Every structure is written in structure tokens, then in C-alpha cells.
Amino acid sequence: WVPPEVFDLVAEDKARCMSEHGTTQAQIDDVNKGNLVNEPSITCYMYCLLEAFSLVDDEANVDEDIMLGLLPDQLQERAQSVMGKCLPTSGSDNCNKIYNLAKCVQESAPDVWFVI
Ligand SMILES: CCCCNS(=O)(=O)c1ccccc1
Numbered sequence: 643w644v645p646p647e648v649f650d651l652v653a654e655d656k657a658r659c660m661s662e663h664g665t666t667q668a669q670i671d672d673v674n675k676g677n678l679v680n681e682p683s684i685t686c687y688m689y690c691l692l693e694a695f696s697l698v699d700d701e702a703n704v705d706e707d708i709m710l711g712l713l714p715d716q717l718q719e720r721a722q723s724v725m726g727k728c729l730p731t732s733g734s735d736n737c738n739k740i741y742n743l744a745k746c747v748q749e750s751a752p753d754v755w756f757v758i
């Protein structure tokens with residue numbers, strides 16, 4: 643559901659976050675197909691990009707209002723619903739907190755969790 647207008651705003655941060663964490667495009671494709679494992683090269687990439695968009699703080703606490711405001715109008719109720727279930731985040735470190743969030747979301751509402 644991501645508009646075009648994100649992808650070029652995000653390009654620099656996507657490239658940086660991939661480089662920093664060893665992330666491949668194939669891993670991103672895999673998450674978008676609902677396949678995610680607790681591998682830092684992908685979990686830290688998701689934290690990296692959330693942080694770039696100001697959607698998480700230094701301990702992976704989610705700014706739910708900012709997150710909702712980037713979703714299309716017809717995804718927002720369902721997104722707010724799943725986030726009521728899946729927040730607050732918890733885990734061993736920032737990457738594992740986002741792994742746990744992604745898992746919770748994909749199990750409960752699997753149109754919501756898309757990774758650029
Ligand atoms: C709800 C999905 C969050 C994880 N994906 S994302 O960081 O690429 C992103 C995509 C679109 C809007 C905001 C963040």
C-alpha cells in the first residue's frame with residue numbers, strides 16, 4: 643500500500659540501513675511474503691528504517707500516532723487494532739523488539755506489516 647512518494651524520500655536511508663546491517667533485498671522480499679526469522683541482518687534493518695522515519699526511539703518504543711499517520715486511511719482501523727494488541731514492544735535488544743512486533747502483527751493482521 644506504500645505510495646510512490648515514500649520510496650524516493652527513503653532511498654538514502656534504505657541504502658544506509660542495508661549497508662550497516664548486511665541486509666539483502668531477498669530478505670526484505672521474504673518479510674513481505676510473511677517469512678521472518680530472528681536474524682539481525684533483517685531485524686536490525688527494520689529497526690534502522692523505523693528509526694530513520696522517527697517511528698521508534700532509542701529503545702524501540704513505537705510512536706503509534708506517527709506510525710498511523712503514514713498508513714492509508716483504509717488500513718488505519720485495522721492497524722490501530724493490531725497495535726493495541728502488539729504494543730508496547732518488548733525483547734532482548736532493539737532489533738529483537740522489532741522482530742517480536744513484526745511477528746505479532748503478521749500473525750494478527752497480515753496486510754499491515756510491509757517493509758520498504
Ligand atoms: C507498519 C510497517 C512498519 C515497518 N515498515 S517500514 O519501516 O518500511 C514503513 C513502511 C511504511 C510506513 C512506515 C514505515
Ligand code: NA
Pocket residue numbers: 681682683684
Ligand atoms: Na543475520
